[PDB]
């Protein structure tokens with residue numbers, strides 16, 4: 001038993017809710033919140049900008065030190081950093097950004113990072129400003145992630161579409 005509330009159960013291990021991931025994280029304090037990161041951990045907009053804003057820019061300060069030490073992430077890769085006031089940890093995962101011409105097949109690799117964590121609160125990778133089809137992203141999630149994932153979808157219209165079309 002865990003504290004996630006109001007989710008629709010899609011599969012054995014995948015759950016979905018129309019919610020603002022920032023508000024959900026603040027209320028749940030999950031062990032892991034996933035960020036929709038880029039390879040430079042520049043959290044300027046989308047989910048990343050919202051999560052970073054909710055940390056009062058502490059996520060960005062920590063991220064800049066991470067990059068200065070380690071260099072950029074790989075597309076499809078991830079790193080674990082602090083969850084600040086939102087979660088114990090933030091798993092920064094880089095899905096491919098279609099608006100940069102990145103290969104979509106990397107989306108499966110991106111989701112594989114979730115399997116290193118027993119339970120996660122997450123957005124749909126490569127959705128939103130990353131330009132992928134969220135219905136495809138949901139399919140890859142269900143077919144790749146084996147750990148327990150609670151997906152927060154900000155847009156109510158999109159949430160209803162994802163549910164209604166789910167196979």
Ligand SMILES: O=C1CCCN1Nc1ncnc2[nH]c3cc(F)ccc3c12
Nearest residue numbers: 021046047050123127128152153154155
């Ligand atoms: O809806 C979708 C589907 C693909 C990613 N994505 N974006 C979010 N998904 C969940 N929670 C979110 N909170 C936000 C706050 C913002 F300012 C901007 C975007 C989001 C967001």
